[PDB]
Scaffold this active site. Structure first.
Site, PDB file in Angstrom:
ATOM      1  N   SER A 115       3.539  68.247   0.769  1.00 60.76           N
ATOM      2  CA  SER A 115       3.021  67.724   1.853  1.00 60.76           C
ATOM      3  C   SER A 115       2.046  66.782   1.670  1.00 60.76           C
ATOM      4  CB  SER A 115       2.436  68.854   2.731  1.00 60.76           C
ATOM      5  OG  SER A 115       3.458  69.318   3.771  1.00 60.76           O
ATOM      6  N   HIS A 153       5.877  59.604   0.234  1.00 54.09           N
ATOM      7  CA  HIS A 153       6.155  59.439  -1.113  1.00 54.09           C
ATOM      8  C   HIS A 153       7.099  58.389  -1.582  1.00 54.09           C
ATOM      9  CE1 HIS A 153       4.298  63.328  -2.122  1.00 54.09           C
ATOM     10  NE2 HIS A 153       4.934  64.005  -1.325  1.00 54.09           N
TER      11      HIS A 153
END
Ligand code: NA
EC number: 3.4.22.56
Lengths: 94, 4, 146
Positions: free
Chosen positions: C35, C93
């Protein structure tokens, strides 16, 4: 009479090619923090490339990682402006 | 501080 | 008229344009991606910042790779005739050339190709700004004393 299909894009990357980018879990990412601050302060004053250069300086000078892991401690970051724009960009007009 |  | 110069993008269309913010915080367990704590601060900061610049902001949270591509496809086919510019912010990401949906990666080229001068005619000649908060690899900058 034609323009390149790749013209008029600007990619404001948070970090240099090949590098991690740093995010603080409390404050947000170094880059977005700095980008918003410089937009708020200069969008009615500076052309966009000059705003993004101020972002580069803010991230480069004011941020340094703190980690209990020596591998990730005391690290730095420089964002990466990639411009295929063909004109100056001001967020204000008139 | 964390990496992405 | 007197002398004219053409060095600046026309930014006085009726609208500044869309600001699409894709905020990927939580990833499918099977991906093994952590996360991204703090990204909601980013997403809120950007929403307010671009609101004050008069962009039509849309915040999208936790999109799969399929949702990202469909959103970009759909947005590129909207009517941009009255809009000065287009902005897309990606928070996720990544690695070099790649951004992650919640379930897997998307080529950045795939996203931006929808807005190419020939594939999105109502943004031809208008600035298309992609703002990317994502890793580009795993190198670390040790810095140097000033
Ligand atoms: Na950052």
């Amino acid at each position: 009479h034609k323009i390149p299909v790749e013209a008029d894009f600007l990619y404001a990357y948070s970090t240099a090619p090949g590098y991690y980018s740093w995010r603080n879990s409390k404050d947000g990412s170094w880059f977005i923090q700095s980008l918003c601050a410089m937009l708020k302060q200069y969008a009615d004053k500076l052309e966009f490339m000059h705003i993004l250069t101020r972002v580069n300086r803010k991230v480069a000078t004011e941020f340094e990682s703190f980690s209990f892991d020596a591998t990730f401690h005391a690290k730095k970051q420089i964002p990466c402006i990639v411009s295929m724009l063909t004109k100056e960009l001001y967020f204000y007009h008139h | 501080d964390e990496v992405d | 008229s007197g002398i004219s110069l053409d060095n600046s993008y026309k930014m006085d269309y009726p609208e500044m344009g869309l600001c699409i913010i894709i905020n990927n915080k939580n990833f499918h367990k099977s991906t093994g991606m952590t996360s991204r704590s703090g990204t909601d601060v980013d997403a809120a900061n950007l929403r307010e910042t671009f609101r004050n610049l008069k962009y039509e902001v849309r915040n999208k949270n936790d999109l799969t790779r399929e949702e990202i591509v469909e959103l970009m496809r759909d947005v590129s086919k909207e009517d941009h005739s009255k809009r000065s510019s287009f902005v897309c912010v990606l928070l996720s990401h990544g690695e070099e050339g790649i951004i992650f949906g919640t379930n897997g990666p998307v080529d950045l080229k795939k996203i931006t190709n929808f807005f190419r001068g020939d594939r999105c005619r109502e943004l031809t000649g208008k600035p298309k700004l992609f703002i990317i908060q994502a890793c580009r690899g795993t190198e670390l900058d040790c810095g140097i004393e000033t």
